[PDB]
Amino acid sequence: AMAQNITARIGEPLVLKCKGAPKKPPQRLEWKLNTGRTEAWKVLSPQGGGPWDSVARVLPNGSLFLPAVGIQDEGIFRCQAMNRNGKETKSNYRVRVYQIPGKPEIVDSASELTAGVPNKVGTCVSEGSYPAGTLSWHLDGKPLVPNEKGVSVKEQTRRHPETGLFTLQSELMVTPARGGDPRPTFSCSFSPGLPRHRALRTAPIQPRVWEPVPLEEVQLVVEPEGGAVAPGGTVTLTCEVPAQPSPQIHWMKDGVPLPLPPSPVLILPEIGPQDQGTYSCVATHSSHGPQESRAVSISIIE
Amino acid sequence: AMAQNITARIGEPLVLKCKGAPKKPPQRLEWKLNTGRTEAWKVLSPQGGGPWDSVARVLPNGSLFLPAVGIQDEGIFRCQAMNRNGKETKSNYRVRVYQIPGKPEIVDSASELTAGVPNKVGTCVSEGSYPAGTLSWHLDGKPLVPNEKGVSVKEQTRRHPETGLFTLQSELMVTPARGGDPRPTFSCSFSPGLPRHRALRTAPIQPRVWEPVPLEEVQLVVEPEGGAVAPGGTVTLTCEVPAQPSPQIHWMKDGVPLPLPPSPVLILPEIGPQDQGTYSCVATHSSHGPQESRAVSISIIE
Amino acid sequence: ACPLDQAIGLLVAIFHKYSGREGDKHTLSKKELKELIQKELTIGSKLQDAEIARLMEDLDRNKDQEVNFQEYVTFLGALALIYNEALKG
Amino acid sequence: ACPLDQAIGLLVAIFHKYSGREGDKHTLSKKELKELIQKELTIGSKLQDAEIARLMEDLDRNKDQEVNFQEYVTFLGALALIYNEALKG
Ligand SMILES: [Ca+2]
Ligand SMILES: [Ca+2]
Ligand SMILES: [Ca+2]
Ligand SMILES: [Ca+2]
Ligand SMILES: [Cl-]
Ligand SMILES: [Cl-]
Ligand SMILES: [Cl-]
Ligand SMILES: [Cl-]
Ligand SMILES: [Cl-]
Ligand SMILES: [Cl-]
Ligand SMILES: [Cl-]
Ligand SMILES: [Cl-]
Ligand SMILES: [Cl-]
Ligand SMILES: [Cl-]
Ligand SMILES: [Zn+2]
Ligand SMILES: [Zn+2]
Ligand SMILES: [Zn+2]
Ligand SMILES: [Zn+2]
Ligand SMILES: [Zn+2]
Ligand SMILES: [Zn+2]
Ligand SMILES: [Zn+2]
Ligand SMILES: [Zn+2]
Ligand SMILES: [Zn+2]
Ligand SMILES: [Zn+2]
Ligand SMILES: [Zn+2]
Ligand SMILES: [Zn+2]
Ligand SMILES: [Zn+2]
Ligand SMILES: [Zn+2]
């Protein structure tokens, strides 16, 4: 367009040329601007000690000088100049500013993820940006897209009135599928909205994925683990009901309750071929249907 | 002593008994105190709406009640009471207060330590304590004493005027000895100055110790690494001078310079028994004495 | 498919198989660790009770009588090179 | 003295022996890692060039073509169990 887009870094000097203006007096040029400070079209006098002389000053060559540009300096800057020949020359600038935040961080990141359930992997944080910008995630070296799979992100943006800069937060939530990557690798990046800029990337994190064994209401454990023992000796059957303080445990052999009193443990010493068969325990309870543990096969080897 | 030491938690209610005082009116008791608020001995009237009625109030039974004790409430509290019989009874309290900080943290901790030189292991931080308290370190499950070995600690204490609470920092510096623990384990603990209290301990950290190979001014590398090769083939001698941009490298066999031009590399193809011997390279330099690399023995196997 | 993923998934499963038997479900007691070593690791078959006790003591660095995943990982790291020498000759 | 301390000290030394040859002195390039595997590890003797390339690709999780100490540790962790099965039979 006619207006030239200017992109300046906050806190840095900026010079705007008044094109087609004589280097030395006499000059016939005038600056008109409209920024966040003025909230209106104002003429900027070339004389020293003006209302804005601490923020913007006209240079001897007609160029406009801002020693330390700020967010409030965003707006339109126009110079109208007559050459000495002399034809009217116009300069139209649209000034936008920016600040790059420090390297983003991942805070409160999880060392271990639990498969099958939502986990907060961590929260990416970015402080001191203008404009806001955006945070995104990477998984195993590739962009991680949200709301697919069981991957969700909670984002928020906060502006500091004290400086006008932004604080960004991105909380990553994943539900690891069973049989998946035992060590997923995540990283976070900040993408400036201005200017066009290479992303600022965090160091990667590599949480581990733990896959919990399916929890049975009635848990049976047999030593030895296999359920096979040489002739003689002993096999101990222990079974437990985690949700009950005083479980009543009745032992069964091949689907039939054994002629025994309730007991959490059943030891089978001096194992003979007659002692072979499928074993399990049944937890009974008042006002509730009984529950059975997993069935264990007990045999003998030669 | 006569004065009973009272220890109360900041922000918590406190009741001070006026011993030997009638439960019901008429009572003849008087509270006199001198705290950080008063900076003087003041009588505390039992009537409601007194100058301190928002901080301390006399109860119907004569006991003194402070709904939320503060640091400024530290001082001396005295009650003088006449029983109905009635003999004068005195109660003398010395009140000190405290606050327990949150769990201490180790911030900016090193993943890898370099043996032979000072390393900042990390900085232990404690926020929100009264009185200050102290930070100490543990190494491999045992107390780590400072300024022994090459272990040093930089400590500082800062008071927040906004609340009177303290921030503590302890920066641990160690110089791992070569041949030492490849994975030292550190932790930090906060010990309250008041009251007598179990220490607040951080999670441990286990940095690794890397032992840098001694860096030679002139570095010689031979492929194969051993310096022994079957009949025929090739052995390549490469040597480098890290501190010089354009090193002049002269090759030597058994302490005698070879009739060759300067070259960073020396390849010995078709190795025969005549090619066996001690090899090294010499980096010469103007205005400096020459430097020699390590000597490599080259042989042949059958 | 990936042999790496399977081995790593296994070492995580093995850790929790024993760590979840008593006390803290994510740390190994002396009892839990000894069962792990004797039942899952080759190096544990030849070791005697005194040797296993000495080994477990050197695995517990902060001396809380527990072995966490970190202390367990470095154990496997050492084991990898120890096994590596044995597979030479 | 402690066989654990020696093995762990060794794996740290081995990592830096190869990682400090080119580029970042504390990460393994494809070139550095391949030399490490072929010269120090038993598992690398039988592997062909295509197999080593595939292996190195699965060790580099963030795909920066480098292998850091962490990526290297989990490698040894897997190796420990892989070697462990081989030492059974
Ligand atoms: Ca446990
Ligand atoms: Ca431990
Ligand atoms: Ca490198
Ligand atoms: Ca990598
Ligand atoms: Cl994956
Ligand atoms: Cl993944
Ligand atoms: Cl019954
Ligand atoms: Cl030690
Ligand atoms: Cl140590
Ligand atoms: Cl010469
Ligand atoms: Cl765990
Ligand atoms: Cl098994
Ligand atoms: Cl490193
Ligand atoms: Cl070697
Ligand atoms: Zn703010
Ligand atoms: Zn993955
Ligand atoms: Zn830039
Ligand atoms: Zn029954
Ligand atoms: Zn403060
Ligand atoms: Zn140590
Ligand atoms: Zn307490
Ligand atoms: Zn020469
Ligand atoms: Zn693979
Ligand atoms: Zn766990
Ligand atoms: Zn197993
Ligand atoms: Zn040991
Ligand atoms: Zn390193
Ligand atoms: Zn080696």
Side-chain angles (χ1 to χ4, degrees), chain B residues 112 182-183 208-210 225, chain D residues 5 8 12 16-17 26 69:
Chain B
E112 193 177 66
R183 33 86 169 88
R208 58 184 179 270
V209 173
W210 162 55
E225 194 177 318
Chain D
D5 293 22
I8 298 169
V12 175
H16 291 82
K17 176 180 179 180
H26 293 266
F69 198 84

Side-chain angles (χ1 to χ4, degrees), chain C residues 5-68:
Chain C
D5 293 22
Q6 257 155 203
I8 298 169
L10 180 62
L11 76 87
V12 175
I14 282 185
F15 177 81
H16 291 82
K17 176 180 179 180
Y18 293 91
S19 73
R21 298 185 171 186
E22 64 171 4
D24 193 323
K25 288 183 172 300
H26 293 266
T27 60
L28 301 160
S29 70
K30 297 285 186 183
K31 212 158 304 181
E32 294 172 326
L33 178 55
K34 177 172 181 176
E35 286 182 345
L36 188 151
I37 297 175
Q38 287 183 321
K39 289 181 175 176
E40 299 287 347
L41 300 187
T42 289
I43 196 184
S45 65
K46 72 218 68 174
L47 297 181
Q48 296 167 314
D49 291 330
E51 292 177 310
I52 299 174
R54 191 264 186 178
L55 173 61
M56 294 190 300
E57 193 64 59
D58 288 333
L59 291 185
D60 179 28
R61 310 304 299 177
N62 65 329
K63 302 305 171 185
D64 59 342
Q65 310 308 306
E66 305 280 339
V67 169
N68 56 25

Side-chain angles (χ1 to χ4, degrees), chain B residues 215-235:
Chain B
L215 285 188
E216 283 266 88
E217 306 82 330
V218 188
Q219 311 171 1
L220 173 58
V221 282
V222 47
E223 175 83 304
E225 194 177 318
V229 164
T234 311
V235 157

